[PDB]
Ligand SMILES: Nc1ncnc2c1ncn2[C@@H]1O[C@H](COP(=O)(O)OP(=O)(O)OP(=O)(O)O)[C@@H](O)[C@H]1O
């Protein structure tokens with residue numbers, strides 16, 4: 001149809017096939033996988049004692065179906081019309097249902113290549129959004145690409161990375177070419193978050209969820225990259241200068257993330273944030289995107305921290321602590337306290353949702369007589385006539 | 390009954406026979422033993438590297454039969470072994486081998502580069518099954534001979550110290566047999582006949598192997614201690630983690646019926662994180678070993694609550710009430726299953 005769209009075939013004969021697909025096949029997939037998600041996520045572990053576990057070939061077919069649906073949805077939301085929501089929801093539910101561990105351990109090379117190519121295509125589309133959004137705001141291909149991104153790529157990637165982080169599939173999936181593609185995706189997400197442009201503040205949020213999900217999912221501490229040698233799962237510690245030369249790398253540990261500053265730099269930024277007293281409207285990107293990334297990073301990297309690992313504490317890639325957590329959360333509630341009176345929005349609620357994992361993580365001894373300020377402010381501000389929360 | 394000879398191994402049975410002979414002699418000589426004049430236990434020497442006149446023909450037959458039994462057991466495991474390439478003989482090349490390690494029997498040793506072959510955990514599992522099965526076959530043969538288990542070797546009374554299940558076997562002997570058989574499997578892989586073997590998926594096992602008369606035991610307080618008014622509390626420490634229920638029961642609760650399957654008991658089950666009364670509903674969390682569950686009942690307001698390690702357990706909704714509506718009746722007593 002795309003080959004002969006402008007040709008003699010303006011009316012494609014296969015209306016029956018197209019209608020049957022878009023009206024039955026997609027919603028059936030969505031509902032079936034929503035109902036039987038536990039069957040496909042089953043493994044050697046037995047969550048569902050009654051039902052059996054999906055076969056390895058079964059999970060291979062699930063991954064193949066997800067990859068094929070992604071290939072279909074690439075750059076064709078406008079041609080799908082109003083069904084694009086249906087296709088993206090099917091991709092969402094399939095992404096939850098995937099079992100990357102078993103797929104990588106015993107999977108078809110075609111399926112593995114399809115997954116790698118899907119991730120590489122996501123990275124390439126993000127780079128195309130880079131190159132056109134930069135000096136493309138004056139000016140269609142650019143409009144189609146940006147619509148495709150903002151509609152599908154952010155939800156798809158966010159859902160997939162949330163699943164990967166929740167099931168710790170990153171150590172089994174994100175490696176070699178997959179890992180360099182994820183590096184490109186991370187650089188792209190950070191550049192979109194940091195950059196200022198009308199198309200950016202029109203979709204700041206979805207970038208926020210996608211980037212936070214990626215931060216949770218990625219198996220390398222990109223923030224505290226100085227402790228690179230300790231991590232065993234990094235390309236810089238596994239597959240060496242020969243493959244630096246073979247496939248292109250930034251070739252420097254600190255240059256792998258040129259636009260991404262260091263963890264201590266972001267910590268200092270958030271400390272003098274709300275203390276320098278700058279306006280929300282000047283640079284809204286930190287409390288909307290960066291703090292979610294910090295929270296996801298700490299939530300993922302706590303258990304690898306030195307205070308959680310007294311054994312070989314010198315052999316840890318990350319150096320987070322409960323004092324880091326309480327300082328960052330203190331900066332969070334200082335920001336909300338200084339910004340609740342003016343510039344009201346749902347972004348405070350979204351930030352609180354994003355920070356829910358860290359307040360769950362923190363020990364209740366601090367909750368005593370440290371979050372007492374939190375509850376007293378949250379009640380005195382809610383003491384208004386209309387009640388909430 | 391199911392055993393058949395695999396269809397491409399007829400003409401190769403001989404070559405496999407002398408191949409197993411080669412593995413047997415090389416394994417015997419590189420287990421640390423060496424050719425000697427006379428057989429002694431303290432000498433740790435193997436004088437049997439001599440002409441076939443004295444060499445046990447029964448031992449030769451045992452070697453051949455255990456080789457064929459080994460291959461029959463791999464085919465029984467589902468290993469539809471495949472012929473890959475003849476090029477194994479071309480690829481195998483003689484490394485540097487010392488004069489002492491060189492066999493004086495006259496045959497040329499063929500120690501191959503066994504390091505680079507990566508043993509996939511599936512073949513490790515079949516190796517475990519091969520060890521178990523070979524040990525079982527040996528035990529069966531000894532029992533047919535009349536051997537019986539003992540603390541130490543007694544030839545007069547035919548008491549064997551090693552006659553125990555392989556799972557409980559001593560480390561040294563199981564390690565020795567295990568390395569011998571991994572060497573055998575690795576030599577088969579070196580000749581290149583690849584193991585097209587199935588994978589043993591995890592199978593659910595009910596694990597209930599107690600007396601058929603009882604799948605559970607119920608402990609309760611006396612009927613006369615039933616409380617009908619007030620706020621009462623007790624504790625239940627779980628030394629293990631598994632099928633256990635704790636709660637409050639009517640005086641008429643049956644002992645042979647599971648707690649919470651009827652109207653006579655209100656229970657909490659931490660194995661599946663559920664609450665039980667006339668049915669099953671999700672509630673609370675799952676305990677672990679050493680966890681203490683505190684059960685509270687309030688007969689004034691007709692409510693029940695459960696706490697795990699101090700923290701109050703709550704159902705899908707935000708309520709902390711495991712059970713909120715019940716008639717006082719004849720009272721409640723602490724109970725567990
Ligand atoms: N006919 C045989 N010839 C050589 N080795 C055997 C024979 N039968 C079994 N084996 C294996 O050899 C190991 C011990 O070597 P050895 O032959 O000295 O013992 P054995 O004479 O077979 O006595 P046992 O049957 O008690 O092991 C045993 O683990 C056994 O599995």
Ligand SMILES: COc1ccc2c(c1)CN(Cc1ccc(C(=O)O)cc1)CCS2
Pocket residue numbers: 417448
């Ligand atoms: C008892 O004369 C024999 C007869 C046959 C063989 C051996 C010794 C040498 N063996 C080593 C061996 C010996 C004894 C034990 C044991 O039972 O402790 C285990 C392994 C390999 C099998 S060929």
